[PDB]
Protein backbone atom coordinates (compact mmCIF):
# COMPACT_ATOMS: atom_id res chain seq x y z
CA UNK A 1 0.00 0.00 0.00
CA UNK A 2 2.98 2.21 0.69
CA UNK A 3 4.01 1.90 -2.96
CA UNK A 4 0.79 3.80 -3.77
CA UNK A 5 0.68 6.18 -0.81
CA UNK A 6 4.28 7.43 -1.03
CA UNK A 7 4.21 8.54 -4.73
CA UNK A 8 1.02 10.43 -3.92
CA UNK A 9 2.80 11.96 -0.92
CA UNK A 10 5.67 12.98 -3.21
CA UNK A 11 3.14 14.58 -5.55
CA UNK A 12 3.02 17.56 -3.16
CA UNK A 13 6.76 18.46 -3.39
CA UNK A 14 6.42 17.99 -7.15
CA UNK A 15 3.50 20.44 -7.12
CA UNK A 16 5.34 23.07 -5.12
CA UNK A 17 8.69 22.64 -6.89
CA UNK A 18 7.45 22.50 -10.48
CA UNK A 19 7.70 25.53 -12.71
CA UNK A 20 4.43 27.50 -12.99
CA UNK A 21 4.22 26.66 -16.71
CA UNK A 22 4.69 22.92 -16.07
CA UNK A 23 2.76 22.35 -12.82
CA UNK A 24 -0.50 21.08 -14.32
CA UNK A 25 1.28 18.87 -16.86
CA UNK A 26 3.61 17.30 -14.29
CA UNK A 27 0.98 16.70 -11.62
CA UNK A 28 -1.60 15.32 -14.07
CA UNK A 29 0.89 12.93 -15.69
CA UNK A 30 2.26 11.63 -12.40
CA UNK A 31 -1.22 11.22 -10.92
CA UNK A 32 -2.18 9.15 -13.97
CA UNK A 33 0.90 7.01 -13.31
CA UNK A 34 -0.10 6.72 -9.64
CA UNK A 35 -3.52 5.42 -10.71
CA UNK A 36 -1.74 2.90 -12.96
CA UNK A 37 0.33 1.84 -9.94
CA UNK A 38 -2.88 1.61 -7.88
CA UNK A 39 -4.21 -0.89 -10.41
CA UNK A 40 -1.80 -3.51 -9.01
CA UNK A 41 -3.92 -4.74 -6.10
CA UNK A 42 -6.53 -6.16 -8.45
CA UNK A 43 -4.14 -9.14 -8.56
CA UNK A 44 -6.35 -11.19 -6.25
CA UNK A 45 -5.78 -14.84 -7.12
CA UNK A 46 -6.59 -16.41 -3.75
CA UNK A 47 -9.63 -15.70 -1.60
CA UNK A 48 -7.28 -14.31 1.07
CA UNK A 49 -7.34 -10.55 1.49
CA UNK A 50 -4.09 -8.74 0.73
CA UNK A 51 -2.75 -7.66 4.14
CA UNK A 52 0.35 -5.69 3.18
CA UNK A 53 1.12 -4.24 6.59
CA UNK A 54 0.09 -4.36 10.22
CA UNK A 55 -1.92 -1.19 9.54
CA UNK A 56 -2.74 -1.36 5.81
CA UNK A 57 -4.95 -3.97 4.17
CA UNK A 58 -6.72 -4.59 0.89
CA UNK A 59 -10.11 -5.99 0.02
CA UNK A 60 -12.46 -6.75 -2.88
CA UNK A 61 -14.51 -3.91 -1.35
CA UNK A 62 -11.66 -1.48 -0.64
CA UNK A 63 -9.86 -2.05 -3.96
CA UNK A 64 -12.45 -0.48 -6.35
CA UNK A 65 -12.72 2.57 -4.08
CA UNK A 66 -8.93 3.03 -4.01
CA UNK A 67 -8.69 2.63 -7.79
CA UNK A 68 -11.59 5.05 -8.28
CA UNK A 69 -9.93 7.66 -6.04
CA UNK A 70 -6.57 7.35 -7.79
CA UNK A 71 -8.31 7.55 -11.16
CA UNK A 72 -10.39 10.54 -10.14
CA UNK A 73 -7.49 12.73 -8.99
CA UNK A 74 -6.19 13.50 -12.55
CA UNK A 75 -9.79 14.01 -13.63
CA UNK A 76 -10.27 16.63 -10.91
CA UNK A 77 -7.04 18.30 -12.03
CA UNK A 78 -8.28 18.41 -15.63
CA UNK A 79 -11.70 19.72 -14.59
CA UNK A 80 -10.33 22.42 -12.31
CA UNK A 81 -7.60 23.54 -14.71
CA UNK A 82 -9.75 25.96 -16.71
CA UNK A 83 -11.55 27.85 -13.95
CA UNK A 84 -8.23 28.65 -12.24
CA UNK A 85 -6.51 30.16 -15.28
CA UNK A 86 -6.82 33.76 -14.03
CA UNK A 87 -5.35 33.01 -10.63
CA UNK A 88 -2.17 33.35 -8.61
CA UNK A 89 0.35 30.53 -8.96
CA UNK A 90 0.46 30.03 -5.18
CA UNK A 91 -3.33 29.67 -5.11
CA UNK A 92 -3.23 27.18 -8.00
CA UNK A 93 -0.57 25.08 -6.28
CA UNK A 94 -2.56 25.24 -3.03
CA UNK A 95 -5.69 23.99 -4.83
CA UNK A 96 -3.70 21.13 -6.37
CA UNK A 97 -2.31 20.40 -2.90
CA UNK A 98 -5.86 20.19 -1.52
CA UNK A 99 -6.85 17.69 -4.22
CA UNK A 100 -3.70 15.60 -3.71
CA UNK A 101 -4.17 15.54 0.07
CA UNK A 102 -7.77 14.43 -0.47
CA UNK A 103 -6.53 11.56 -2.66
CA UNK A 104 -3.88 10.51 -0.11
CA UNK A 105 -6.25 10.61 2.84
CA UNK A 106 -8.99 8.73 0.99
CA UNK A 107 -6.63 5.97 -0.13
CA UNK A 108 -5.42 5.64 3.46
CA UNK A 109 -9.04 5.63 4.69
CA UNK A 110 -10.10 2.84 2.34
CA UNK A 111 -6.95 0.80 3.01
CA UNK A 112 -6.98 1.29 6.80
CA UNK A 113 -7.46 -1.91 8.80
CA UNK A 114 -8.30 -0.21 12.12
CA UNK A 115 -11.58 1.55 12.84
CA UNK A 116 -9.96 4.32 14.89
CA UNK A 117 -7.50 5.08 12.07
CA UNK A 118 -10.48 4.99 9.70
CA UNK A 119 -12.18 7.62 11.88
CA UNK A 120 -9.05 9.79 11.97
CA UNK A 121 -8.68 9.73 8.19
CA UNK A 122 -12.46 10.25 7.88
CA UNK A 123 -12.24 13.64 9.58
CA UNK A 124 -8.91 14.29 7.86
CA UNK A 125 -10.86 14.06 4.60
CA UNK A 126 -13.53 16.27 6.15
CA UNK A 127 -11.03 19.17 6.34
CA UNK A 128 -9.81 19.91 2.76
CA UNK A 129 -13.25 19.49 1.21
CA UNK A 130 -14.40 22.29 3.51
CA UNK A 131 -11.40 24.38 2.46
CA UNK A 132 -12.07 23.74 -1.25
CA UNK A 133 -15.80 24.51 -1.04
CA UNK A 134 -15.40 27.69 0.99
CA UNK A 135 -12.24 29.14 -0.57
CA UNK A 136 -12.96 28.46 -4.25
CA UNK A 137 -16.75 28.40 -4.37
CA UNK A 138 -18.46 30.96 -6.56
CA UNK A 139 -21.61 32.23 -4.82
CA UNK A 140 -22.20 33.69 -1.36
CA UNK A 141 -23.79 30.54 0.09
CA UNK A 142 -20.52 28.58 0.04
CA UNK A 143 -19.91 29.54 3.67
CA UNK A 144 -23.33 28.25 4.72
CA UNK A 145 -22.72 25.12 2.64
CA UNK A 146 -19.39 24.55 4.38
CA UNK A 147 -20.95 25.01 7.82
CA UNK A 148 -23.78 22.60 7.00
CA UNK A 149 -21.43 19.97 5.55
CA UNK A 150 -18.87 20.22 8.36
CA UNK A 151 -21.24 20.12 11.29
CA UNK A 152 -23.62 17.53 9.87
CA UNK A 153 -20.52 15.34 9.52
CA UNK A 154 -19.15 16.18 12.98
CA UNK A 155 -22.40 15.71 14.90
CA UNK A 156 -22.66 12.39 13.10
CA UNK A 157 -19.07 11.38 13.80
CA UNK A 158 -18.75 12.15 17.53
CA UNK A 159 -21.05 9.26 18.64
CA UNK A 160 -19.08 7.10 16.21
CA UNK A 161 -15.92 7.97 18.14
CA UNK A 162 -17.62 7.17 21.45
CA UNK A 163 -18.84 3.83 20.06
CA UNK A 164 -15.41 2.93 18.67
CA UNK A 165 -13.70 3.62 22.00
CA UNK A 166 -16.44 1.58 23.72
CA UNK A 167 -15.78 -1.37 21.41
CA UNK A 168 -12.02 -1.02 21.93
CA UNK A 169 -12.47 -1.02 25.72
CA UNK A 170 -14.76 -4.05 25.48
CA UNK A 171 -12.91 -6.37 23.09
CA UNK A 172 -9.39 -4.91 23.38
CA UNK A 173 -8.35 -4.52 19.76
CA UNK A 174 -10.59 -2.42 17.42
CA UNK A 175 -8.94 -4.20 14.47
CA UNK A 176 -11.24 -5.13 11.59
CA UNK A 177 -10.04 -8.69 11.06
CA UNK A 178 -9.96 -9.57 14.77
CA UNK A 179 -13.47 -8.16 15.14
CA UNK A 180 -14.64 -10.09 12.07
CA UNK A 181 -13.28 -13.35 13.48
CA UNK A 182 -14.07 -13.12 17.20
CA UNK A 183 -17.22 -11.06 16.79
CA UNK A 184 -19.66 -11.42 19.67
CA UNK A 185 -23.44 -11.36 19.59
CA UNK A 186 -25.22 -8.57 21.45
CA UNK A 187 -27.77 -9.36 24.15
CA UNK A 188 -30.42 -6.97 22.70
CA UNK A 189 -30.54 -4.20 25.30
CA UNK A 190 -31.23 -0.49 25.09
CA UNK A 191 -27.52 0.21 25.54
CA UNK A 192 -26.83 -2.02 22.54
CA UNK A 193 -29.53 -0.22 20.54
CA UNK A 194 -27.87 3.10 21.34
CA UNK A 195 -24.48 1.60 20.45
CA UNK A 196 -25.89 0.53 17.08
CA UNK A 197 -27.31 4.01 16.50
CA UNK A 198 -24.04 5.69 17.49
CA UNK A 199 -21.96 3.56 15.16
CA UNK A 200 -24.45 3.90 12.29
CA UNK A 201 -25.52 7.56 12.33
CA UNK A 202 -22.12 8.95 11.28
CA UNK A 203 -22.18 6.99 8.04
CA UNK A 204 -25.91 7.58 7.65
CA UNK A 205 -25.15 11.30 7.71
CA UNK A 206 -22.17 10.95 5.37
CA UNK A 207 -24.10 9.17 2.73
CA UNK A 208 -27.41 11.00 2.67
CA UNK A 209 -30.63 9.70 4.21
CA UNK A 210 -33.97 11.41 3.57
CA UNK A 211 -33.51 13.36 6.81
CA UNK A 212 -30.03 14.79 7.39
CA UNK A 213 -29.42 15.01 3.59
CA UNK A 214 -29.85 18.80 3.42
CA UNK A 215 -26.10 19.48 3.41
CA UNK A 216 -25.52 17.61 0.15
CA UNK A 217 -27.38 19.88 -2.34
CA UNK A 218 -25.97 23.01 -0.69
CA UNK A 219 -22.40 21.72 -0.81
CA UNK A 220 -22.79 20.46 -4.37
CA UNK A 221 -24.32 23.72 -5.63
CA UNK A 222 -21.73 25.90 -3.92
CA UNK A 223 -18.68 23.70 -4.55
CA UNK A 224 -16.36 23.97 -7.54
CA UNK A 225 -16.24 21.14 -10.06
CA UNK A 226 -13.47 19.20 -8.32
CA UNK A 227 -15.31 19.46 -5.00
CA UNK A 228 -18.56 18.19 -6.52
CA UNK A 229 -16.59 15.40 -8.19
CA UNK A 230 -14.83 14.23 -5.03
CA UNK A 231 -17.99 14.52 -2.90
CA UNK A 232 -20.43 12.75 -5.21
CA UNK A 233 -17.98 10.07 -6.28
CA UNK A 234 -16.03 9.12 -3.12
CA UNK A 235 -17.39 10.54 0.12
CA UNK A 236 -20.88 9.04 0.04
CA UNK A 237 -19.23 5.74 -0.84
CA UNK A 238 -16.93 6.31 2.13
CA UNK A 239 -20.00 6.38 4.36
CA UNK A 240 -21.27 3.20 2.69
CA UNK A 241 -17.88 1.52 3.11
CA UNK A 242 -17.92 2.39 6.80
CA UNK A 243 -21.39 0.88 7.19
CA UNK A 244 -20.32 -2.35 5.49
CA UNK A 245 -17.21 -2.51 7.68
CA UNK A 246 -18.88 -1.82 11.02
CA UNK A 247 -22.09 -3.81 10.48
CA UNK A 248 -20.34 -7.11 11.21
CA UNK A 249 -20.15 -6.64 15.00
CA UNK A 250 -23.86 -5.82 15.26
CA UNK A 251 -25.17 -9.21 14.13
CA UNK A 252 -28.37 -10.02 16.10
CA UNK A 253 -30.08 -6.62 16.34
CA UNK A 254 -29.63 -5.12 12.88
CA UNK A 255 -32.56 -7.24 11.67
CA UNK A 256 -34.98 -5.10 13.67
CA UNK A 257 -32.87 -1.98 14.21
CA UNK A 258 -32.60 -1.36 10.46
CA UNK A 259 -36.36 -0.90 9.97
CA UNK A 260 -36.70 2.94 10.12
CA UNK A 261 -33.74 3.55 7.83
CA UNK A 262 -35.01 1.16 5.14
CA UNK A 263 -38.34 3.02 5.05
CA UNK A 264 -36.52 6.35 5.16
CA UNK A 265 -34.32 5.29 2.23
CA UNK A 266 -37.13 4.01 0.01
CA UNK A 267 -39.54 6.88 0.56
CA UNK A 268 -36.66 9.35 0.38
CA UNK A 269 -35.45 8.05 -2.95
CA UNK A 270 -38.99 8.56 -4.25
CA UNK A 271 -39.18 12.10 -2.87
CA UNK A 272 -35.73 13.10 -4.11
CA UNK A 273 -36.45 11.78 -7.60
CA UNK A 274 -39.62 13.89 -7.46
CA UNK A 275 -37.48 16.91 -6.53
CA UNK A 276 -35.27 16.11 -9.52
CA UNK A 277 -38.41 16.28 -11.64
CA UNK A 278 -39.41 19.71 -10.32
CA UNK A 279 -35.88 21.10 -9.92
CA UNK A 280 -34.75 24.33 -11.60
CA UNK A 281 -31.00 23.88 -10.98
CA UNK A 282 -28.82 21.38 -12.83
CA UNK A 283 -26.34 20.80 -10.01
CA UNK A 284 -29.23 20.48 -7.55
CA UNK A 285 -30.81 17.90 -9.85
CA UNK A 286 -27.60 15.87 -9.98
CA UNK A 287 -27.24 16.18 -6.19
CA UNK A 288 -30.74 14.90 -5.48
CA UNK A 289 -30.21 12.07 -7.97
CA UNK A 290 -27.14 11.19 -5.89
CA UNK A 291 -29.35 11.19 -2.79
CA UNK A 292 -31.71 8.71 -4.47
CA UNK A 293 -28.95 6.33 -5.56
CA UNK A 294 -27.32 6.45 -2.14
CA UNK A 295 -30.74 5.73 -0.60
CA UNK A 296 -30.75 2.53 -2.65
CA UNK A 297 -27.28 1.75 -1.26
CA UNK A 298 -28.49 2.40 2.32
CA UNK A 299 -31.42 0.02 1.89
CA UNK A 300 -29.21 -2.75 0.50
CA UNK A 301 -26.62 -2.46 3.27
CA UNK A 302 -29.38 -2.42 5.89
CA UNK A 303 -31.05 -5.57 4.57
CA UNK A 304 -27.63 -7.31 4.59
CA UNK A 305 -28.07 -9.84 1.83
CA UNK A 306 -25.13 -11.04 -0.35
CA UNK A 307 -27.03 -9.86 -3.43
CA UNK A 308 -27.62 -6.57 -1.61
CA UNK A 309 -23.93 -6.08 -0.80
CA UNK A 310 -22.82 -6.94 -4.33
CA UNK A 311 -25.42 -4.60 -5.82
CA UNK A 312 -24.41 -1.93 -3.31
CA UNK A 313 -20.77 -2.12 -4.41
CA UNK A 314 -21.73 -2.04 -8.09
CA UNK A 315 -24.04 0.92 -7.59
CA UNK A 316 -21.31 2.67 -5.56
CA UNK A 317 -18.73 2.49 -8.34
CA UNK A 318 -21.20 3.09 -11.18
CA UNK A 319 -22.83 6.05 -9.45
CA UNK A 320 -19.48 7.61 -8.63
CA UNK A 321 -18.42 7.48 -12.27
CA UNK A 322 -21.71 8.67 -13.75
CA UNK A 323 -22.27 11.43 -11.18
CA UNK A 324 -18.79 12.80 -11.82
CA UNK A 325 -19.52 12.69 -15.56
CA UNK A 326 -22.82 14.55 -15.13
CA UNK A 327 -21.16 17.15 -12.91
CA UNK A 328 -18.41 17.71 -15.47
CA UNK A 329 -20.92 18.19 -18.29
CA UNK A 330 -22.95 20.64 -16.20
CA UNK A 331 -19.73 22.46 -15.33
CA UNK A 332 -18.83 22.77 -19.02
CA UNK A 333 -22.15 24.48 -19.67
CA UNK A 334 -21.68 26.63 -16.56
CA UNK A 335 -18.22 27.68 -17.73
CA UNK A 336 -19.82 28.73 -21.01
CA UNK A 337 -22.76 30.69 -19.62
CA UNK A 338 -21.85 31.51 -15.95
CA UNK A 339 -25.27 30.41 -14.71
CA UNK A 340 -26.61 27.09 -13.45
CA UNK A 341 -30.21 27.75 -14.49
CA UNK A 342 -31.38 24.67 -16.35
CA UNK A 343 -34.05 26.21 -18.61
CA UNK A 344 -31.75 28.92 -19.96
CA UNK A 345 -29.49 26.93 -22.31
CA UNK A 346 -31.75 24.74 -24.40
CA UNK A 347 -30.69 23.81 -27.92
CA UNK A 348 -27.12 22.75 -27.21
CA UNK A 349 -27.24 19.62 -29.39
CA UNK A 350 -27.07 21.94 -32.41
CA UNK A 351 -23.75 23.56 -31.54
CA UNK A 352 -22.23 20.75 -29.40
CA UNK A 353 -22.85 17.40 -31.15
CA UNK A 354 -20.39 15.13 -29.35
CA UNK A 355 -20.96 16.92 -26.06
CA UNK A 356 -24.61 16.02 -26.64
CA UNK A 357 -23.44 12.44 -27.24
CA UNK A 358 -21.65 12.48 -23.88
CA UNK A 359 -24.81 13.94 -22.32
CA UNK A 360 -26.90 11.15 -23.84
CA UNK A 361 -24.52 8.43 -22.66
CA UNK A 362 -24.30 9.99 -19.19
CA UNK A 363 -28.08 10.06 -18.86
CA UNK A 364 -28.38 6.51 -20.17
CA UNK A 365 -25.93 5.59 -17.43
CA UNK A 366 -27.93 7.67 -14.93
CA UNK A 367 -31.04 5.66 -15.60
CA UNK A 368 -30.55 1.91 -15.41
CA UNK A 369 -29.55 0.66 -18.87
CA UNK A 370 -29.02 -3.13 -18.97
CA UNK A 371 -25.54 -3.11 -20.52
CA UNK A 372 -24.25 -1.10 -17.57
CA UNK A 373 -23.05 -1.66 -14.03
CA UNK A 374 -25.66 0.93 -13.01
CA UNK A 375 -28.45 -1.47 -13.96
CA UNK A 376 -26.44 -4.38 -12.55
CA UNK A 377 -26.26 -2.75 -9.12
CA UNK A 378 -29.82 -1.41 -9.16
CA UNK A 379 -31.25 -4.73 -10.37
CA UNK A 380 -29.49 -6.83 -7.74
CA UNK A 381 -30.50 -4.32 -5.06
CA UNK A 382 -34.08 -4.73 -6.33
CA UNK A 383 -33.77 -8.52 -6.16
CA UNK A 384 -32.48 -8.44 -2.59
CA UNK A 385 -35.16 -5.94 -1.54
CA UNK A 386 -37.92 -8.05 -3.09
CA UNK A 387 -36.53 -11.05 -1.21
CA UNK A 388 -36.59 -8.94 1.96
CA UNK A 389 -40.24 -8.03 1.37
CA UNK A 390 -42.28 -8.44 -1.80
CA UNK A 391 -43.95 -5.04 -1.43
CA UNK A 392 -40.74 -3.05 -1.95
CA UNK A 393 -41.17 -3.53 -5.71
CA UNK A 394 -43.82 -0.78 -5.75
CA UNK A 395 -41.39 1.81 -4.37
CA UNK A 396 -38.65 0.48 -6.64
CA UNK A 397 -40.88 0.80 -9.70
CA UNK A 398 -41.97 4.33 -8.83
CA UNK A 399 -38.33 5.29 -8.32
CA UNK A 400 -37.29 3.78 -11.66
CA UNK A 401 -40.09 5.57 -13.52
CA UNK A 402 -39.24 8.95 -12.00
CA UNK A 403 -35.52 8.30 -12.60
CA UNK A 404 -36.10 7.79 -16.31
CA UNK A 405 -38.34 10.85 -16.34
CA UNK A 406 -35.85 13.26 -14.80
CA UNK A 407 -32.93 11.92 -16.86
CA UNK A 408 -34.76 12.26 -20.16
CA UNK A 409 -36.19 15.59 -19.00
CA UNK A 410 -32.61 16.76 -18.46
CA UNK A 411 -31.58 15.65 -21.95
CA UNK A 412 -34.60 17.14 -23.69
CA UNK A 413 -34.63 20.46 -21.85
CA UNK A 414 -30.89 21.17 -22.03
CA UNK A 415 -29.91 19.62 -25.39
CA UNK A 416 -33.00 19.43 -27.61
CA UNK A 417 -35.41 22.13 -28.71
CA UNK A 418 -34.80 25.43 -30.41
CA UNK A 419 -31.39 26.93 -29.71
CA UNK A 420 -31.27 30.06 -27.58
CA UNK A 421 -29.61 32.10 -30.31
CA UNK A 422 -28.80 35.09 -28.10
CA UNK A 423 -25.97 33.19 -26.37
CA UNK A 424 -23.05 34.36 -28.50
CA UNK A 425 -20.43 33.16 -25.99
CA UNK A 426 -20.76 29.46 -26.81
CA UNK A 427 -17.18 28.46 -27.55
CA UNK A 428 -17.10 25.24 -29.64
CA UNK A 429 -15.41 22.74 -27.28
CA UNK A 430 -12.24 22.18 -25.33
CA UNK A 431 -10.24 19.06 -26.08
CA UNK A 432 -9.60 19.03 -22.32
CA UNK A 433 -13.26 18.72 -21.38
CA UNK A 434 -14.05 16.28 -24.19
CA UNK A 435 -11.15 14.20 -22.85
CA UNK A 436 -12.65 14.59 -19.37
CA UNK A 437 -15.97 13.15 -20.56
CA UNK A 438 -14.15 10.32 -22.35
CA UNK A 439 -12.09 9.49 -19.25
CA UNK A 440 -15.32 9.29 -17.30
CA UNK A 441 -17.23 7.18 -19.81
CA UNK A 442 -14.63 4.65 -21.03
CA UNK A 443 -14.10 3.10 -17.54
CA UNK A 444 -17.89 2.62 -17.38
CA UNK A 445 -17.72 0.62 -20.63
CA UNK A 446 -14.75 -1.42 -19.41
CA UNK A 447 -16.35 -2.21 -16.05
CA UNK A 448 -19.52 -3.21 -17.90
CA UNK A 449 -17.36 -5.52 -20.02
CA UNK A 450 -15.83 -7.13 -16.91
CA UNK A 451 -18.04 -6.64 -13.83
CA UNK A 452 -16.29 -9.27 -11.70
CA UNK A 453 -14.00 -6.55 -10.33
CA UNK A 454 -16.87 -4.40 -9.07
CA UNK A 455 -18.47 -7.35 -7.28
CA UNK A 456 -17.65 -6.83 -3.62
CA UNK A 457 -17.14 -9.07 -0.61
CA UNK A 458 -20.00 -11.51 -0.83
CA UNK A 459 -19.35 -13.15 -4.21
Amino acid sequence: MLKIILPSLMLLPLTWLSSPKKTWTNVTSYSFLISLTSLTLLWQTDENYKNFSNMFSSDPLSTPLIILTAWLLPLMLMASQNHLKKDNNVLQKLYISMLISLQILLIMTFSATELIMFYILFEATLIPTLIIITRWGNQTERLNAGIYFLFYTLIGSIPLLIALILIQNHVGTLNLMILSFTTHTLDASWSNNLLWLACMMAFLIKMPLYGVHLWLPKAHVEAPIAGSMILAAILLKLGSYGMIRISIILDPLTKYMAYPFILLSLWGMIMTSSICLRQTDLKSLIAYSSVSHMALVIASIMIQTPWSFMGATMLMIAHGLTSSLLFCLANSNYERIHSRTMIMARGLQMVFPLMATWWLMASLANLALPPSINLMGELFITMSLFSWSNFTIILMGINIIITGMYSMYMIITTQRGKLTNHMINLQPSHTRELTLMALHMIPLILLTTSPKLITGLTM
Binding site: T185, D251, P252, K255, Q304, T305
Partner: protein
Protein backbone atom coordinates in the same frame (compact mmCIF):
# COMPACT_ATOMS: atom_id res chain seq x y z
CA UNK B 1 0.34 7.15 38.30
CA UNK B 2 3.80 5.59 38.14
CA UNK B 3 5.58 8.34 40.09
CA UNK B 4 5.31 6.50 43.41
CA UNK B 5 6.98 3.27 42.29
CA UNK B 6 9.96 1.99 44.31
CA UNK B 7 13.30 3.13 42.95
CA UNK B 8 11.84 6.25 41.31
CA UNK B 9 14.56 8.87 41.53
CA UNK B 10 12.92 12.30 41.12
CA UNK B 11 13.44 14.56 38.09
CA UNK B 12 15.64 11.97 36.39
CA UNK B 13 15.36 12.00 32.60
CA UNK B 14 16.99 8.61 31.94
CA UNK B 15 17.90 6.27 34.81
CA UNK B 16 20.45 3.52 34.37
CA UNK B 17 17.77 0.88 33.78
CA UNK B 18 17.04 2.72 30.54
CA UNK B 19 20.60 1.77 29.58
CA UNK B 20 19.34 -1.82 29.47
CA UNK B 21 17.03 -0.99 26.58
CA UNK B 22 17.86 -0.87 22.87
CA UNK B 23 17.98 2.72 21.62
CA UNK B 24 16.19 3.98 18.50
CA UNK B 25 17.98 3.08 15.29
CA UNK B 26 18.44 6.82 14.45
CA UNK B 27 16.62 6.32 11.14
CA UNK B 28 13.14 5.34 12.30
CA UNK B 29 9.86 7.02 11.27
CA UNK B 30 9.54 8.97 14.53
CA UNK B 31 12.91 10.67 14.10
CA UNK B 32 12.52 11.09 10.34
CA UNK B 33 9.16 12.77 10.98
CA UNK B 34 10.77 14.96 13.65
CA UNK B 35 13.39 16.07 11.14
CA UNK B 36 10.64 16.72 8.60
CA UNK B 37 8.85 18.86 11.19
CA UNK B 38 12.04 20.83 11.81
CA UNK B 39 12.46 21.39 8.07
CA UNK B 40 8.84 22.53 7.78
CA UNK B 41 9.41 24.83 10.76
CA UNK B 42 12.34 26.44 8.96
CA UNK B 43 10.34 26.81 5.74
CA UNK B 44 7.37 28.33 7.59
CA UNK B 45 9.69 30.72 9.45
CA UNK B 46 11.21 31.88 6.16
CA UNK B 47 7.76 32.38 4.62
CA UNK B 48 6.55 34.33 7.66
CA UNK B 49 9.63 36.57 7.70
CA UNK B 50 9.08 37.05 3.93
CA UNK B 51 12.35 35.52 2.76
CA UNK B 52 12.82 32.94 0.01
CA UNK B 53 11.28 29.78 1.36
CA UNK B 54 14.23 27.44 0.76
CA UNK B 55 16.92 29.55 -0.92
CA UNK B 56 17.49 31.55 2.28
CA UNK B 57 18.59 30.63 5.79
CA UNK B 58 20.26 27.28 5.13
CA UNK B 59 22.06 27.45 8.48
CA UNK B 60 18.72 28.13 10.20
CA UNK B 61 17.10 25.16 8.47
CA UNK B 62 20.06 22.95 9.37
CA UNK B 63 19.86 24.05 13.01
CA UNK B 64 16.10 23.45 13.07
CA UNK B 65 16.36 19.93 11.64
CA UNK B 66 19.31 19.05 13.90
CA UNK B 67 17.65 20.33 17.08
CA UNK B 68 14.37 18.57 16.30
CA UNK B 69 16.13 15.25 15.63
CA UNK B 70 18.29 15.61 18.76
CA UNK B 71 15.44 16.41 21.15
CA UNK B 72 13.21 13.82 19.50
CA UNK B 73 15.85 11.12 19.93
CA UNK B 74 16.31 11.74 23.63
CA UNK B 75 12.57 12.10 24.28
CA UNK B 76 11.91 8.92 22.29
CA UNK B 77 14.47 7.02 24.38
CA UNK B 78 12.78 8.30 27.55
CA UNK B 79 9.34 7.23 26.31
CA UNK B 80 10.69 3.79 25.38
CA UNK B 81 11.98 3.51 28.95
CA UNK B 82 8.58 4.53 30.33
CA UNK B 83 6.61 2.04 28.23
CA UNK B 84 9.12 -0.72 29.00
CA UNK B 85 8.92 -0.14 32.75
CA UNK B 86 5.11 -0.01 32.56
CA UNK B 87 5.10 -3.42 30.87
CA UNK B 88 7.62 -4.70 33.43
CA UNK B 89 5.49 -3.53 36.37
CA UNK B 90 2.34 -5.03 34.84
CA UNK B 91 3.99 -8.41 34.26
CA UNK B 92 5.45 -8.37 37.77
CA UNK B 93 2.04 -7.65 39.29
CA UNK B 94 0.52 -10.48 37.23
CA UNK B 95 3.19 -12.85 38.54
CA UNK B 96 2.70 -11.59 42.10
CA UNK B 97 -1.10 -12.07 42.13
CA UNK B 98 -2.02 -15.18 40.13
CA UNK B 99 -5.31 -15.82 41.95
CA UNK B 100 -6.73 -12.56 40.57
CA UNK B 101 -5.70 -13.37 36.96
CA UNK B 102 -6.71 -16.97 36.26
CA UNK B 103 -5.58 -18.66 33.07
CA UNK B 104 -9.13 -19.09 31.82
CA UNK B 105 -9.63 -22.19 29.68
CA UNK B 106 -11.50 -21.54 26.45
CA UNK B 107 -13.34 -24.47 24.90
CA UNK B 108 -13.58 -25.37 21.24
CA UNK B 109 -16.45 -24.60 18.89
CA UNK B 110 -17.91 -28.03 19.57
CA UNK B 111 -19.38 -27.55 23.06
CA UNK B 112 -20.57 -23.94 22.94
CA UNK B 113 -23.93 -23.36 21.26
CA UNK B 114 -23.81 -19.97 19.59
CA UNK B 115 -27.38 -18.86 18.80
CA UNK B 116 -28.07 -18.56 15.08
CA UNK B 117 -29.82 -15.46 13.75
CA UNK B 118 -31.12 -16.00 10.21
CA UNK B 119 -31.22 -13.06 7.82
CA UNK B 120 -34.27 -14.06 5.74
Amino acid sequence: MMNGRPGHEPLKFLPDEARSLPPPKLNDPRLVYMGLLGYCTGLMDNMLRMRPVMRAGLHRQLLFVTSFVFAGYFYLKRQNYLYAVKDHDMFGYIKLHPEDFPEKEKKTYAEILEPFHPVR
